[PDB]
Structure 1
Amino acid sequence: CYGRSMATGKLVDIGEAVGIVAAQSIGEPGTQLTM
């Protein structure tokens, strides 16, 4: 259901902490937005 891991281009391995990856991906470009 998660699909391929964007960082590796292959099906996500068992045990990947996708929650941390998603949080970091959402938060990294945070400083580039308007306030």
Structure 2
Amino acid sequence: KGEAIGVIAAQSIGEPGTQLTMRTFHIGGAASRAAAESSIQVKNKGSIKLS
């Protein structure tokens, strides 16, 4: 009892954004892109369900 959880949560959310923004020059300006897949490929035996 008496723990200021709101400040903790606000800091926890805020920190990674600033950190990763300031850590962007390590890769050297390279592009982050994955080729868009054009198919579905199941990996295991079982039934298929559509929703």
| TM-score, with length taken from structure 2 | 0.35
| Bigger-Rg structure (1/2) | 2
Kindly indicate whether structure 1 or structure 2 has the higher relative contact order, using CA contacts under 8 Å at least 6 residues apart: 1
User: Greater helix percent: which structure?
Assistant: 1
| TM-score, with length taken from structure 1 | 0.49
